[PDB]
Homo-oligomer: A and B are copies of this chain.
Amino acid sequence: KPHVNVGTIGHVDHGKTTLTAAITTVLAKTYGGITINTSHVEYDTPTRHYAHVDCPGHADYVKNMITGAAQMDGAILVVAATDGPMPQTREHILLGRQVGVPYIIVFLNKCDMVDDEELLELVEMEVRELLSQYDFPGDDTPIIRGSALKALEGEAEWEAKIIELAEALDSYIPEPERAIDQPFLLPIEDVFSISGRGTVVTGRVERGIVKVGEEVEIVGIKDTTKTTCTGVEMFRKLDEGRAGENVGVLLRGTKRDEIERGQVLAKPGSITPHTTFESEVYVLSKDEGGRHTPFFKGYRPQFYFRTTDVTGTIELPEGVEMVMPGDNIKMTVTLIHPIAMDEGLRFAIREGGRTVGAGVVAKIIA
């Protein structure tokens, strides 16, 4: 069955842990470095298998969304009807946009505590306005009015709202693109000359398929060039290399001195090089073995993108003067040379190979 990665987000005390348990309980009855703190559960509807991540606190949601083990195919925003939207409601929607969470469904929780239908519609309208503020489609967003606690306790009218939520997961969250179905991309690691064959470049194929005879672009670091794949070897047992495989790709004519580590091989026109991008960055705390002191607009660390690192300079948002350990911030980075990147690409910030930060490319500038 199709595998979908989801997770709960929202303000502390709004009911993310309770909802996580209610979903597991009801679906079983009905259909039966950086420190990463997570709760992991799996559950099934008739057509799909879900892997669900919840986190204990705000800082953990920030780290999961920016560098967690699984990319969320969709998020369940939990909003308590009693408080309405709160600061981490807003912060988690914003972070969802910045890190590329593609869909959000809302579970309006604690509706057992709110008798007033006008009050429920008022909270729903505030949530849709907030979703639309951050470029989610607030008017089309599924909003389920429920009680995680009364569903976990076995009340039929509230268990029905959990079923309604799972029906929205199935209908509203599409399966992501499989890596094998995306445009070919190989992050280049080693570069060899083989006598009377030519230049071989190695790496693990990230996306797609490369076949003997296909044109490839060499993208990043230096101006983009093009060549032809004249052979493909797979490391561990017509010729081709597939997403997830370690391969050696033989190139026509390209010399050792015309291709390097940290460039990519890609389907021509599928990916572009950039120096300048907006990002969301988590700065490691002192307890995670990161920086002890804040940094300012001058800071010049190394950015680690796939198989290489590149120096760059940062700009901070309007009215922000410094960035403290453990903070997350929007920063505009200018790398000393271009790197192949799309929105959603993860990177590390390092100081002599101590990790000090984790980022996601939010928006490419020019």
**A interface residue numbers (CB < 8 A to B):** 12-13, 80, 82-87, 90-91, 110, 113-114, 119, 122-123, 126, 291-300, 322, 351-352, 354
Contacts and interface: CB of A to CB of B under 8 A. Distances in A.
Contact of A295 (B12, B82, B294, B300): B82
B293 A126 contact: yes
Contacts of A12: 300
Given A293-B84, A295-B83, A300 B113 contact: no
B122 A292 contact: yes
A285 to B, nearest CB: 15
Nearest to A129: B292
A351 B293 contact: no
B82 A296 contact: yes
A293 B13 contact: no
Given A126-B293, A300-B13, A351 B119 contact: no
Contacts of A123: 293
A12 B114 CA distance: 34
B80 A298 contact: yes
- Looking at chain A's contact residues, is the secondary structure mostly helix, strand, loop, or mixed? loop
A329 to B, nearest CB: 15
B86 A351 contact: yes
A83 B123 CA distance: 41
A249 to B, nearest CB: 26
A293 B81 CA distance: 9
A286 to B, nearest CB: 10
Contacts of A295: 82-84
A298 B82 contact: yes
A34 to B, nearest CB: 19
Given A87-B352, A352-B87, A119 B82 contact: no
7 contacts: A82-B297, A82-B298, A82-B299, A84-B291, A85-B292, A90-B352, A119-B293
